Amino acid sequence: YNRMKLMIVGNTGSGKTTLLQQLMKTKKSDLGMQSATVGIDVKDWPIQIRDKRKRDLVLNVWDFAGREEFYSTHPHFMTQRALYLAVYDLSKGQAEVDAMKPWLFNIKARASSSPVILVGTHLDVSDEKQRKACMSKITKELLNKRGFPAIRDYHFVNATEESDALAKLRKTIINESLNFKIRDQLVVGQLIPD
Ligand SMILES: Nc1nc2c(ncn2[C@@H]2O[C@H](COP(=O)(O)OP(=O)(O)O)[C@@H](O)[C@H]2O)c(=O)[nH]1
């Protein structure tokens, strides 16, 4: 079972599908313009982990928008068994990123031991000063008294076309999805009889 279980903290307009279509990418005259909504779904995406076996690990993340539509049930999907992704753009990185605190705390309430990584999508939405304005605020409020740890990492991406920033996104995923284990867990990709 070479699959990682995950959940997203973000909302419509951040750009998660924008990133994904250039990760979990297809052919010509298929993928197009992006939109957003709220409901419950999930997406399966391979991670290029090893130089001799790149195709061996896959992410499976639950997709929903950070609205009361999911938030009211969100506390019941919480577990150390899930890894978390956070997706905001580079304007939101300063202005709205903050929106996930009530979600992060539901995660915390069960386990804050599992990592969360924040990606700043739509890098080009903001200028260098604003991008730094986001970064320089986010990375200062990360750790606290009540048990919420600092984010494990962060990355900024231009997501609408083929992109090296997505390659960097992937590199980040490769490391965290490889380095993180829940106790000395059997690697999920092992002979585990369901
Ligand atoms: N052109 C452009 N659109 C973006 C970008 N990032 C975010 N958006 C928009 O944000 C929306 C995607 O929202 P999403 O994060 O996937 O929310 P979800 O429906 O809850 O998963 C789409 O309308 C995208 O066009 C970007 O890189 N540039």
Side-chain angles (χ1 to χ4, degrees), residues 10 13 15 27-28 32 36 39 46 53-54 65-66 75 82 86 93 95 99 102 109 111 115 120 133 147 149-150 159 165 167 170 189 193:
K27 296 180 180 179
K28 185 175 180 180
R53 298 296 301 174
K54 289 181 181 179
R170 184 173 63 251

Short mmCIF file of all heavy atoms in Angstrom, two decimals, residues 11-17 34-37 64-65 122, ligand 1, unseen atoms left out:
data_model
loop_
_atom_site.label_atom_id
_atom_site.label_comp_id
_atom_site.label_asym_id
_atom_site.label_seq_id
_atom_site.Cartn_x
_atom_site.Cartn_y
_atom_site.Cartn_z
N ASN A 11 -9.05 27.08 0.65
CA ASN A 11 -10.41 27.40 0.22
C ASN A 11 -10.42 27.69 -1.26
O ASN A 11 -9.38 27.60 -1.93
CB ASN A 11 -10.94 28.57 1.05
N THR A 12 -11.58 28.00 -1.79
CA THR A 12 -11.68 28.25 -3.19
C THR A 12 -10.88 29.47 -3.51
O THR A 12 -10.95 30.47 -2.78
CB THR A 12 -13.15 28.47 -3.57
N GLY A 13 -10.18 29.46 -4.63
CA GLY A 13 -9.39 30.60 -5.02
C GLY A 13 -7.90 30.47 -4.66
O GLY A 13 -7.08 31.25 -5.14
N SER A 14 -7.52 29.50 -3.80
CA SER A 14 -6.10 29.39 -3.49
C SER A 14 -5.28 28.91 -4.67
O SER A 14 -4.27 29.50 -4.99
CB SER A 14 -5.82 28.47 -2.34
N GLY A 15 -5.75 27.89 -5.38
CA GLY A 15 -5.00 27.38 -6.54
C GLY A 15 -4.51 25.95 -6.41
O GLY A 15 -3.51 25.59 -7.04
N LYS A 16 -5.18 25.13 -5.63
CA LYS A 16 -4.73 23.76 -5.50
C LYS A 16 -4.89 22.97 -6.80
O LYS A 16 -3.97 22.23 -7.18
CB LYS A 16 -5.40 23.03 -4.36
N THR A 17 -6.03 23.11 -7.49
CA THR A 17 -6.22 22.37 -8.73
C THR A 17 -5.33 22.95 -9.81
O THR A 17 -4.90 22.24 -10.73
CB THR A 17 -7.67 22.44 -9.21
N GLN A 34 -9.19 27.03 -14.87
CA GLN A 34 -9.53 26.55 -13.55
C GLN A 34 -10.66 27.33 -12.88
O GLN A 34 -10.77 28.56 -13.02
CB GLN A 34 -8.26 26.60 -12.70
N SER A 35 -11.42 26.63 -12.04
CA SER A 35 -12.53 27.17 -11.25
C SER A 35 -12.46 26.56 -9.86
O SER A 35 -11.47 25.88 -9.55
CB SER A 35 -13.85 26.81 -11.89
N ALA A 36 -13.43 26.84 -9.00
CA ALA A 36 -13.38 26.31 -7.64
C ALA A 36 -14.75 26.17 -7.00
O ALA A 36 -15.67 26.91 -7.35
CB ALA A 36 -12.51 27.20 -6.81
N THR A 37 -14.87 25.23 -6.06
CA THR A 37 -16.11 25.03 -5.31
C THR A 37 -15.94 24.28 -4.00
O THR A 37 -14.83 24.04 -3.54
CB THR A 37 -17.17 24.32 -6.17
N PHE A 64 -11.46 19.57 -0.33
CA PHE A 64 -12.61 20.30 0.15
C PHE A 64 -12.20 21.75 0.33
O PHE A 64 -11.03 22.05 0.55
CB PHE A 64 -13.13 19.69 1.45
N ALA A 65 -13.17 22.64 0.29
CA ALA A 65 -12.90 24.04 0.56
C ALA A 65 -13.16 24.33 2.01
O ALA A 65 -14.16 23.88 2.57
CB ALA A 65 -13.76 24.93 -0.30
N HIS A 122 0.35 30.52 -7.20
CA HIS A 122 0.20 31.73 -7.94
C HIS A 122 1.29 32.67 -7.52
O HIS A 122 1.03 33.83 -7.21
CB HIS A 122 -1.15 32.35 -7.64
N1 LIG B 1 -4.72 32.16 -13.60
C1 LIG B 1 -4.51 31.73 -12.33
N2 LIG B 1 -5.58 31.30 -11.59
C2 LIG B 1 -5.39 30.84 -10.26
C3 LIG B 1 -4.04 30.60 -9.78
N3 LIG B 1 -4.15 30.21 -8.49
C4 LIG B 1 -5.41 30.23 -8.14
N4 LIG B 1 -6.23 30.55 -9.19
C5 LIG B 1 -7.71 30.27 -9.24
O1 LIG B 1 -8.25 29.65 -8.03
C6 LIG B 1 -9.30 28.70 -8.35
C7 LIG B 1 -8.88 27.30 -7.75
O2 LIG B 1 -9.34 27.08 -6.37
P1 LIG B 1 -9.01 25.75 -5.46
O3 LIG B 1 -7.81 26.11 -4.65
O4 LIG B 1 -8.52 24.59 -6.45
O5 LIG B 1 -10.21 25.37 -4.51
P2 LIG B 1 -11.03 24.04 -4.23
O6 LIG B 1 -12.27 23.94 -5.27
O7 LIG B 1 -11.61 24.11 -2.74
O8 LIG B 1 -10.15 22.87 -4.37
C8 LIG B 1 -9.41 28.70 -9.91
O9 LIG B 1 -10.45 29.55 -10.45
C9 LIG B 1 -8.03 29.23 -10.35
O10 LIG B 1 -8.03 29.90 -11.62
C10 LIG B 1 -2.95 30.86 -10.73
O11 LIG B 1 -1.84 30.35 -10.61
N5 LIG B 1 -3.21 31.75 -11.79
#
